Amino acid sequence: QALLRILKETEFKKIKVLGSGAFGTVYKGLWIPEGEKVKIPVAIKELREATSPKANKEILDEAYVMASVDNPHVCRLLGICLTTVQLIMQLMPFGCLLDYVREHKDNIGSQYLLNWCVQIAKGMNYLEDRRLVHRDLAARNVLVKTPQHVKITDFGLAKLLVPIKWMALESILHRIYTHQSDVWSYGVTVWELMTFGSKPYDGIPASEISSILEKGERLPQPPICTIDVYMIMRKCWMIDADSRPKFRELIIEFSKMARDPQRYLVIQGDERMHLPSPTDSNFYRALMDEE
Amino acid sequence: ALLRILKETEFKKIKVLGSGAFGTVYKGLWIPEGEKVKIPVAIKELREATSPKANKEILDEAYVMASVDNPHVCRLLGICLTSTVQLIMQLMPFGCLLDYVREHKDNIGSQYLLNWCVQIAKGMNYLEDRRLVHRDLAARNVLVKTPQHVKITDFGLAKLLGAEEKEYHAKVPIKWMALESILHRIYTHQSDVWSYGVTVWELMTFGSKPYDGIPASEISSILEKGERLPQPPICTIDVYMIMRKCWMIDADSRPKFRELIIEFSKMARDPQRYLVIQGDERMHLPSPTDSNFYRALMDEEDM
Numbered sequence: 404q405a406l407l408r409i410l411k412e413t414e415f416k417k418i419k420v421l422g423s424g425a426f427g428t429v430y431k432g433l434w435i436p437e438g439e440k441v442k443i444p445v446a447i448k449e450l451r452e453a454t455s456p457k458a459n460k461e462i463l464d465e466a467y468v469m470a471s472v473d474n475p476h477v478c479r480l481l482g483i484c485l486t487t488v489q490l491i492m493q494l495m496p497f498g499c500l501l502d503y504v505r506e507h508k509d510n511i512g513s514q515y516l517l518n519w520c521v522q523i524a525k526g527m528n529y530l531e532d533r534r535l536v537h538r539d540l541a542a543r544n545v546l547v548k549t550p551q552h553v554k555i556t557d558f559g560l561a562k563l564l565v566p567i568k569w570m571a572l573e574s575i576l577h578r579i580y581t582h583q584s585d586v587w588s589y590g591v592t593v594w595e596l597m598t599f600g601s602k603p604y605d606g607i608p609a610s611e612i613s614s615i616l617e618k619g620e621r622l623p624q625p626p627i628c629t630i631d632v633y634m635i636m637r638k639c640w641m642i643d644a645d646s647r648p649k650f651r652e653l654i655i656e657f658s659k660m661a662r663d664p665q666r667y668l669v670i671q672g673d674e675r676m677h678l679p680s681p682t683d684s685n686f687y688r689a690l691m692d693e694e
Numbered sequence: 695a696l697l698r699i700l701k702e703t704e705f706k707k708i709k710v711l712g713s714g715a716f717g718t719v720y721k722g723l724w725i726p727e728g729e730k731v732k733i734p735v736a737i738k739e740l741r742e743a744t745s746p747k748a749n750k751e752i753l754d755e756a757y758v759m760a761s762v763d764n765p766h767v768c769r770l771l772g773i774c775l776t777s778t779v780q781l782i783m784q785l786m787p788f789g790c791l792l793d794y795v796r797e798h799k800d801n802i803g804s805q806y807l808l809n810w811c812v813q814i815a816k817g818m819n820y821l822e823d824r825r826l827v828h829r830d831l832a833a834r835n836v837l838v839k840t841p842q843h844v845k846i847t848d849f850g851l852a853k854l855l856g857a858e859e860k861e862y863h864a865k866v867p868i869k870w871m872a873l874e875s876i877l878h879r880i881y882t883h884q885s886d887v888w889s890y891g892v893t894v895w896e897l898m899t900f901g902s903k904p905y906d907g908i909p910a911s912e913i914s915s916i917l918e919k920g921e922r923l924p925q926p927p928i929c930t931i932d933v934y935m936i937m938r939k940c941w942m943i944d945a946d947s948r949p950k951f952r953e954l955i956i957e958f959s960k961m962a963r964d965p966q967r968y969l970v971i972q973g974d975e976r977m978h979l980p981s982p983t984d985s986n987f988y989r990a991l992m993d994e995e996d997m
């Protein structure tokens with residue numbers, strides 16, 4: 404309850420737009436704490452359709468759970484303004500991972516890609532441990548805090564609100580959403596990362612996707628992926644939800660691959676491709692990522 | 695690895711924030727190599743050094759400034775050794791504590807004031823434990839990360855830059871320095887406790903100027919004659935007594951920072967018994983909701 408700060412329209416303002424969607428619009432904004440002469444940058448999501456006070460009470464009820472996620476790889480809702488639903492969180496200068504890997508296409512070392520896989524599996528394992536089903540995991544829903552530090556956002560938004568190309572078969576046919584359907588989605592998100600942001604099933608129309616999944620077609624092996632990595636993606640997309648890896652197992656498998664990334668990803672340029680470096684990491688961290 | 699050497703090409707000064715005797719502070723933007731993002735930072739471009747020092751001696755002293763690891767001391771993050779010496783640190787949008795107590799004059803609750811004394815003493819007690827001496831502690835060299843959280847800054851810069859001889863009579867923080875330091879240029883952890891006493895007096899007077907109307911060149915003499923700063927109106931004698939012990943001529947009789955931490959922590963637990971402030975019961979103490987929001991937004995540091 405003290406993890407979510409209820410804001411009033413007069414103590415913050417939107418300053419510039421960053422991104423949009425069906426959900427709502429994303430703004431860089433400024434928080435002006437009462438009685439102070441400072442303007443603190445925030446990110447703000449304004450939802451598309453406002454609604455009644457009864458719907459606001461439902462949103463606030465869910466916002467109290469979102470405010471309670473404490474994990475380095477999941478975004479925490481910080482504040483809310485009920486006008487008309489504005490969600491406030493920490494501003495990330497880097498935007499979303501999908502855009503990041505498109506902008507940096509073919510310029511990303513194997514070390515980063517697998518660390519992002521690890522971190523996203525950690526974030527999803529956390530949600531599962533908290534009994535939260537995301538229902539829309541995708542590269543567009545992972546935000547970049549620093550190139551070394553990514554965070555899942557917008558878990559539960561699909562519920563309070565249709566990405567068919569990311570959904571488990573059982574979720575298309577029967578609107579069944581579990582943590583194991585989130586594992587199917589995780590697999591599509593790793594595919595996104597490994598193709599530097601390609602659209603999944605980019606020909607196929609969404610209404611025909613369930614058809615080809617039953618025929619046993621799956622997204623193809625991305626050029627840079629060794630068979631080891633494509634094996635893991637293919638398990639994420641088995642028909643029997645319970646045959647799919649657990650998020651805890653994905654952390655372990657991807658963590659082992661990230662101790663030797665050039666073995667599992669074959670990337671032209673990789674040896675001299677930028678990695679972390681303790682000096683830069685301390686720097687990013689001290690400047691803007693002390694968590 | 696604790697200190698990033700920067701090239702001039704990867705940052706830019708954007709707006710000046712304020713000027714001191716040691717240099718001017720700018721808000722600037724870092725641009726990491728290979729990225730299209732601008733990361734806000736603070737840049738202090740240093741004034742000319744009197745002691746004329748080699749680029750390497752600087753580096754050896756910047757590495758020590760980069761090693762301070764404490765919630766209540768600012769760490770040097772990076773350095774540019776070009777035509778000037780430019781220090782890069784994390785941007786503190788609130789500015790310094792001196793400006794802040796001036797701006798919120800008579801609008802600050804005793805719980806805040808005493809908590810700031812705790813945190814500053816915790817900051818100095820860490821530097822003592824590392825066997826480091828600040829030399830220029832003052833309200834102007836305490837930064838506000840959040841109203842709940844202050845940090846000592848500019849550590850090391852007094853050693854770094856030195857001072858011409860004429861500056862010792864008119865820079866040299868004469869009115870904050872122990873008598874030994876003014877006379878013999880001794881600097882110890884106990885002369886730091888003198889500056890801390892003055893710093894505390896700055897806070898309790900909401901930023902008044904110490905010994906206002908006395909020329910700095912005569913501070914020497916009045917201290918020997920036994921004049922000290924007067925009791926600020928909001929201080930009970932408990933608080934004033936501690937400040938007076940900090941200014942004893944005998945450096946060994948002044949309190950230790952570790953003792954100051956306990957004493958002020960105790961006063962912090964019953965703050966209306968030790969500071970008398972009109973309307974203190976209507977002063978904002980920060981609710982857990984508010985503190986959590988500051989911390990998650992701007993202050994994710996350890997404690």
Ligand SMILES: CSc1nc(-c2ccnc(NC(C)=O)c2)c(-c2cccc(NC(=O)c3cccc4c3NC(=O)c3ccccc3N4)c2)[nH]1
Pocket residue numbers: 421422426429446447448465469478479480490491492493494495496497498499543544546556557558559560561563
């Ligand atoms: C995908 S695009 C994007 N980018 C950003 C962003 C953020 C920071 N910096 C940047 N920087 C740059 C340069 O772009 C961008 C944001 C954003 C901005 C503000 C807030 C939020 N999220 C939340 O509040 C939130 C947090 C947790 C879970 C959910 C959340 N939301 C919901 O609606 C929701 C509603 C009901 C039930 C569940 C929900 N789920 C997301 N969105």
